[PDB]
């Protein structure tokens, strides 16, 4: 009941009902949480 | 005791020398890393019946961009502060031509002096602190991201790039610890820079109202 | 005979309860492993546990080896009578 | 409180059909037994304690 | 440490101080019966609370059919070779797993810890 | 362990064995048999007989078990039970080489030139609970352990550039007053935190509330090995702290909103707010 | 980028959630074209470098030309570009893949 009307507007900003900006980009990245998956960096762990 | 008292006065001093360095004032380099025994030798070994009187500790600094605008900080002597006692300072500012002033209150102030500082709005702006709060730099904590205050020329670039008004930004009230650490007035915009795990870096803005 | 020494931050009772739980939990595990390493390739419990269709590796040991130790409110069975759990025991019996 | 800190807790009673709390020694005296050697033998059964 | 009752109206005698001979006087507040104090101390407050319950357990507990018994530890005062033991069953249960005994011989009632 | 004891709160009734109110009309009377030695070796050095000598005495016995565990001895107690309450009291004490630690107190005789007995009992019943020996008032019990997981370890980047974890002692309390705990010495002011978020709001700010709330949501979700994507946590903890202050998601939080009149009529106060409108 | 990762992820883990898988996309291309990992390859390295640059240019999340809209784009696709540059380097794709 709290968060009913938050949605992504046509310029990729996540706005409230009164158009109060909540995030400049959805999830801070801009991607849907449906087409992502786990990977590894393989650059931070090894030694110098 | 005094060993606890010579320790605190050095700690509180080291904090303020960064607080005024953040606001963009000019502080000499070695003043930032003034170790304890160096402080103990310069200003005095002990303030209990000693040379450090909580006066002889005051600081006057000048801005980087302009040598005229200066800031003062006062260390009152009484635990809680009265009325003319700040007017003693208001007179000390009146004589030296300085508007930016701070007072490091020792333990408290009277509802009296709360009325006596909100009146001189257009001139002689003073900031009231507490001795306890200045004992630790909160800006170097883990949870606190990095804030930066934007000039009034940059703020008009946001609202014209994202085609925003100034009512549509996220808000911050000028009463929380970091709003006062930077000396922020209503109508300013502060920029937060935090690292995130999905993108790597994210910049958000806050309107102080 | 007052030969126990409490550990930092532990009452004498609570140190005793913690050790009695360790002895009993290890028997549920060590007996449980015995129930498994004796199973066969044709067993039908192992066939539903291995493929992940239904069941867990503790139901095998509970059916074959030992049900284990019960507890209400996250602690051992309390003294519902006065200094007893049932009228079939003698007072202040702390056995398993 | 800087007053009852020294004396300690006071035994009270909440009788039916009355509004306010009542100290127990009062309701004891309302039955007779005004003396304090006779009251303190109905409540304490051995004076070596 | 005890208590004092008035000898006339049977009430509680309060302690008072007289500025003449430097002696504690017990006074009444209904009448004014007087007398002097023999121990000259008023208040005592035991915070350790290390009272040994050997002074609180009763000798007739050896008639309980729901308590364990022993043939190992005999009684010293009578030589009976059967006892009945239990725990503190009271407060001060921080390190309270001692084991008080009571002889079960009729009319001995001897009690002892170990 | 020393900083542990220095942080924990300790009152007087935790370090006392028993107390007794005696009656010495003269300091040489010494009603109890054996305290005459030390009180006398004070008495040949007699000071502070200014107005009178109070015939009422207060005698306190201490437990060296509870004394040494906090590294206390009655010297510091003796000055602070004086320095902190006034000078109306006067404390003479034993030497700790004697097995039992007793210190006797009399009222300042300047008052004798409301009964003093009830006053002395009031003071006795007031000092054992309002002692404030050490530590912060509200934090009651503080534990100690070093973890084995990589969650609370100290991960450093060595000189050759490898992540190495180190076991380090951490402390956990039951009770919160963080602004003072942060200000103490040899306590890390960066990584110390509290699990209450209104406290972080008053002490640290608003962004710290955002991040702490996110962390606690993550910790409660990933407790049983489950997993939930990040965007949902971020969006929730962003819309929850958007208007500057902490508005809870409750009936009151929804009421204080910039939303229209026909939405607050769907929540239990239709007619009055619509009459206002 | 190796030094920036060590401050983004202080603990030291390596499991992150990202767009399209890269190791599986290399494994697929190794079989749509019958790549024999036994003979010398014909992939010039300065081709790898410039191809990865050009690809990184065409991944716009925030489309704009002026600053404050050309740095938010670099903040959005910061982690993915690091991953893409570390996986498709010239040494690895001439040695392993
Ligand atoms: Zn009488
Ligand atoms: Zn016997």
mmCIF file of C-alpha atoms in Angstrom, chain E residues 15-18 21-24 29 39-49, chain F residues 13 16-23 25-26 31 53 55-56 115 117 121 124 128:
data_model
loop_
_atom_site.group_PDB
_atom_site.id
_atom_site.type_symbol
_atom_site.label_atom_id
_atom_site.label_comp_id
_atom_site.label_asym_id
_atom_site.label_seq_id
_atom_site.Cartn_x
_atom_site.Cartn_y
_atom_site.Cartn_z
ATOM 1 C CA UNK E 15 16.274 4.412 68.661
ATOM 2 C CA UNK E 16 17.054 7.874 69.984
ATOM 3 C CA UNK E 17 20.123 9.845 71.050
ATOM 4 C CA UNK E 18 20.608 11.836 74.253
ATOM 5 C CA UNK E 21 25.908 10.447 78.587
ATOM 6 C CA UNK E 22 26.487 9.455 74.929
ATOM 7 C CA UNK E 23 24.419 6.248 75.123
ATOM 8 C CA UNK E 24 21.803 4.864 72.732
ATOM 9 C CA UNK E 29 6.321 7.186 70.051
ATOM 10 C CA UNK E 39 24.851 -3.870 71.479
ATOM 11 C CA UNK E 40 24.864 -0.233 70.261
ATOM 12 C CA UNK E 41 24.345 -1.012 66.585
ATOM 13 C CA UNK E 42 21.209 -0.472 64.552
ATOM 14 C CA UNK E 43 21.388 -1.361 60.868
ATOM 15 C CA UNK E 44 23.048 -4.250 59.035
ATOM 16 C CA UNK E 45 22.637 -5.215 55.363
ATOM 17 C CA UNK E 46 24.055 -8.508 54.068
ATOM 18 C CA UNK E 47 24.633 -8.261 50.317
ATOM 19 C CA UNK E 48 26.735 -11.415 49.878
ATOM 20 C CA UNK E 49 23.642 -13.441 50.869
ATOM 21 C CA UNK F 13 26.074 -2.626 45.539
ATOM 22 C CA UNK F 16 29.951 -4.471 48.701
ATOM 23 C CA UNK F 17 29.520 -7.421 51.055
ATOM 24 C CA UNK F 18 27.476 -5.893 53.886
ATOM 25 C CA UNK F 19 26.923 -2.528 55.556
ATOM 26 C CA UNK F 20 26.084 -1.632 59.160
ATOM 27 C CA UNK F 21 25.038 1.590 60.893
ATOM 28 C CA UNK F 22 26.833 1.688 64.238
ATOM 29 C CA UNK F 23 26.878 4.359 66.963
ATOM 30 C CA UNK F 25 29.650 9.008 69.988
ATOM 31 C CA UNK F 26 33.448 9.180 70.154
ATOM 32 C CA UNK F 31 32.013 -0.452 69.319
ATOM 33 C CA UNK F 53 32.026 14.722 65.810
ATOM 34 C CA UNK F 55 27.855 10.201 66.943
ATOM 35 C CA UNK F 56 26.329 8.362 63.965
ATOM 36 C CA UNK F 115 16.842 13.630 61.880
ATOM 37 C CA UNK F 117 19.530 8.806 61.235
ATOM 38 C CA UNK F 121 19.784 5.647 55.849
ATOM 39 C CA UNK F 124 23.096 4.643 52.334
ATOM 40 C CA UNK F 128 24.719 1.877 46.407
#
